[PDB]
Point group: C4
Chain length 385, copies 4
């Protein structure tokens, strides 16, 4: 059966920890991959964790210099949620250095980009069979969401970027039906930057929250229906979500350019005028993580919020964060439940090692009593390599 | 398709060894988890072993100081019975430092407690989906059975404790239907201590034998129906149950306080006025194990018994002990078969290592010819690390 | 649907290699068990290899002194045919130091003996549930076939021995229906010895060829119907079967006491008056293996034969040998196909190591063109331990 | 339902990266086999990778001298596509040093040759059961395709060679129906050499492209219907196929003998008069790989082509190459899709190691936009052994 997306998003007041993966603690002795960008996607029977292996095992000589991110060895794989990425319990999905995966209620769809920086090619697979193929239209690094896409009524929607990472790029929205592209629309967004977007279906409509890697320290968004009729803007809130970001002050609808020249992959949930902002705790480095509920944070420019929940302590390393969705066909409720994941990066950029790998944690929103704590990666670096 | 639980408990005269796990012998070279409290639960198709990993492998540098029991890295996992807990053959269940799991004949229910000591939160999962959530009441260490619960007619019953571990705590009984809490009742038991209960169904009723960690050297019990109408007391037999216990003498129906200040998790089966007491051979440390049949132990205060069976030698290390049952929907008989498991702890508290891990053995009650022997953990400590 | 054993045994003229296990070559780096007596049993869907793990991994410090054969750590496990006995791909069956397993077309039956020498107890499991239990009746040592048993209709037939290994013991035949013993008969065989039998069904009758560890260098046999009406004797051929055997000469109908004081587990197939003898190439040590077709070997005492096939070279180590059967419900033919397995022992009793482990090979009987070769264990001893 | 063939080969204009396993650069730490001659075969549900293990793990003392390609330890195994060949995730198929496997839409058929050089015997298995067995004729090294065969209307067709590898051999075509050899025809091809052929079905007929190991630097071919009515010849193109080959010039319809003393396993697809030649970039050693589209290459002797795609760089090691097919019963299209695989050999023959192992990559043909790149093996030799 298909996967309808006509039911609105569940209102939540807290987040309960779903899964925790101890990849780097177990990888000092066991055989686990050196992974990056570990997003989670769910199916009407189970939820899988998708990661981008670098072709090497942890605590090995082939994990040297894994700060590189575009090599002919990166592959997309998947393992059951909560389990370490290992060669003996992972499933091969595609060969890619940028990827995304979804389930339309019948079969898995995976998009994977692999090729030269000028002329990369995206290969679409439906049930493990190549169905369609895209090529770069502006001859720069072609990127995908790095997260799961949104599938509504049997059609799955993704966003791809092509162009400079510090200038004006080109943005495209795709509608995919059973692995074949049936409609693509190029966004007309001058003075905007969309990159590594997190998309969820709400009311037969798709909402994506992206990162501005050029001149924005808040987060842009785009919303479109099944005919790809889009609306663009930024999240107007004093609770900035990007990293690096300035200290909290009055935001604006336009790209706020105070400390916005890079970013980290993030997300947010729209609840009318409110937002559930998930950001780090350090305005300079990727340290800590927290959840903030701003009652009027989607259109009102002030730094006042209502609820804050602690997820990772301010002294513990953090990284990419994205959002996934559990449909009523799986949970059994009458609405769509929001969930999210966080990646805990530990390695070369900020520590004196030769590699770079990240563990993951996952939370799901509930209407019950929840507590805030710190669930970090308890690895003891450096390793023996 | 759901478990009825309306049959009486099978009368037995002996115990036949069901499974044995050589986790620590194999973990010196292989990749196995550092586990603790490995209870067992059965389903209408198979029986699983549930353990609480610390997030590190045996013979690894991350197994240092695993005598700690409440950390953000402890997770609940499960593996098929008789198999070593390994990253490559285990299934992730929940994130918890105190957990219990059950099967109501349709789907698996797992309760998992994780959070701060003052404010811990229990997350209930039905078929891998978060369904309900509980929070601590008295803001002390919220703890659960550490063993499987009892499911009768589609409802599963558990007991949770909240308060001092050497004083008067608060005790609660829960009824769970398809992951949602339907009814909770707070026990009114002055001068009692209930902790780490082992519950089994018998004639549509639930009986739990718990651990008195405050002033009792015998074991308390509680019995309730599906409406949570409870009866409380102590197992008044001269054959004491806890590990720090006096030499055998006339017991009492109230808490006997001679050597009882820090118990160990155990069990017992009621057969009218009789009991099947499972205890350790040493009254000082967790060494040895045996099963004793007292014909009038549940109500008569004398130290005379009838049958004793040897399960672990007096010079071999022992640990936690709990009880599980096999329903007629699985065995095919007309009554509920009693079974139990023992954990064999090897590590820091009594040996000169840096870690603490435990293997397990299992026994099933039969009406045939059985022998008493010693089935210890044949590990040779210390390890390389 | 249950297995019927009414179709006669297939006439064959050669043996084609079925599977080969490189357990010891792979176990120098990988994690494989230290196994012994690796028999094979088939099911209407697949064939499994059953072995007796000793609780330790190969190339490990717990492999010291594995020449011992009765310890509380030995367990019966199973893995798919042709695959190494690894902890990550094996299934736990029972706790035993002497075991056998069978499939009656519906579910797996496993018998496992574990306990003291004087008082060992056999635990019968049907579909993983304990169903019946036997105790030693002469209180010396309780042994089983170490191979698969014969299943006709829903009943499976095994032979158990109890008594001296160098004197006169007591012999019993069991009929098992759905895990429960329905009829047992004690053999009256003065001046005979049956220790490790290989049983196959032919025409709704069961024939077992056993080991004489007291008198004879030839092999005894027993044949019985479903009511346990047995016939006893010895294989009257000049082509002797046991490993400590004399040079070929005229055989005898009773125990030939020339070099018969020990023995090795073996087999033979009856074809009227003919036999398919599987023996070792060395009359003093367990080296080499071959299959010999004697047209009148079952009753005619002469050393002349017709066909010989080489399976292991005379300079390569060999060991236990047994026979299994592929029923028409699996192969699809109209008769029962003969098959056999060989164990290749490498370790302490003949080499300068600290351990003792064995690999396995399998052959199937065919009416096509086949070749004789040597398929030994290519391990390079000693290891690094 | 059985595969039908019955449809023509899909016209393609490019090749999309399908799978890639990083076996050699994961086996430096993990446990992977020392494999050689991989190939991929697809079933109506999944595609498997078949390899010929040498009985030893990578980075182990038993990897010494893994260049002897005919030993009694080589076995045929299979693992899911894109996954490393490991003892814990691969299935045993047969014992062979020369093998091929196929799926007729119902069950897997595997052919495996193992035995002496003069007297090797091929064992045919259907659904894991030995069904037929065939023996050598000219008492030389009996070879099979080393690739998947072609199954049309429930019958699978293979080619075997027997005779000198530098002279005139004997070639045979087999039709196999449910594991039993139905019809065999001996090819009458004087002054031809057929070896290691790659066969695909097209319009209910079989076309095979082989290697000439005696005096040809181009590639021979053979095409036959279901009654084994064959047509023989050579690929008449100036774009030569074998690895030892001269510089491009006008080809010939016979065995062009310039540098044809040896060869490497390869393939080609016929599209009327055109060819899709897959060859290496180095005319002396096995380095690089590319696909070339010659519009009239099958019959027109000129060196002009129209399309070239880069798959491995000229400075990266390459090896065997073969072709497989995805039927409409799996993809869902209306025609047969062509795909191919490449093996990346790294080890003793060309580098200063003690072993020889190869990774693999796979491509499938599409009518979309594709890019040429280099997807080599990123191993860093020598290892620690």
């Amino acid at each position: 059966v298909k996967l309808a997306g006509n039911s609105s998003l569940c209102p939540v007041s807290g987040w309960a920890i779903y899964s925790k993966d101890n990849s780097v603690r177990i990888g000092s002795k066991g055989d686990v991959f050196v992974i990056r960008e570990p997003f989670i996607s769910c199916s009407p029977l189970e939820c899988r964790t998708f990661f981008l292996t670098q072709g090497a095992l942890l605590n090995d000589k082939h994990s040297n210099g894994t700060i590189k991110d575009r090599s002919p060895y990166r592959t997309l794989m998947s393992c059951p949620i909560g389990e370490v990425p290992s060669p003996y319990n992972s499933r091969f999905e595609s060969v890619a250095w940028s990827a995304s995966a979804c389930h339309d209620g019948i079969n898995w769809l995976t998009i994977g980009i692999s090729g030269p920086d000028s002329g990369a090619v995206a290969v679409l697979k439906y049930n493990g069979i190549i169905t369609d193929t895209i090529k770069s239209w502006r001859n720069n690094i072609l990127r995908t969401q790095e997260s799961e896409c949104a599938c509504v009524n049997g059609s799955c929607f993704t966003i791809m970027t092509d162009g400079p990472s510090d200038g004006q790029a080109s943005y495209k929205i795709f509608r995919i039906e059973k692995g074949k592209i049936v409609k693509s629309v190029e966004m007309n967004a001058p003075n905007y930057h969309y990159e590594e977007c997190s998309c969820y279906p709400d009311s037969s409509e798709i909402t994506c929250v992206c990162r501005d890697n050029w001149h924005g320290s808040n987060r842009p968004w785009v919303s479109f229906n099944q005919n790809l009729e889009y609306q663009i803007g930024y999240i107007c809130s004093g609770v900035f979500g990007d990293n690096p970001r300035p200290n909290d002050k009055t935001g604006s609808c336009g790209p706020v350019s105070s400390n916005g020249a890079n970013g980290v992959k993030g997300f947010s949930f729209k609840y009318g005028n409110g937002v559930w902002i998930g950001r780090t705790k350090s305005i300079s480095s990727r340290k800590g993580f927290e959840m903030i509920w701003d009652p009027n944070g989607w259109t009102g420019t002030d730094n006042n919020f209502s609820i804050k929940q602690d997820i990772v302590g301010i002294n513990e390393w953090s990284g990419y964060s994205g959002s996934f969705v559990q449909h009523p066909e799986l949970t059994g409720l009458d609405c769509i439940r929001p969930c999210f994941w966080v990646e805990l990066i530990r390695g070369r950029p900020e520590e004196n090692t030769i590699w770079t790998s990240g563990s993951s944690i996952s939370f799901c929103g509930v209407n019950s009593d929840t507590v805030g704590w710190s669930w970090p990666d308890g690895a003891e670096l450096p390793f023996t390599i």
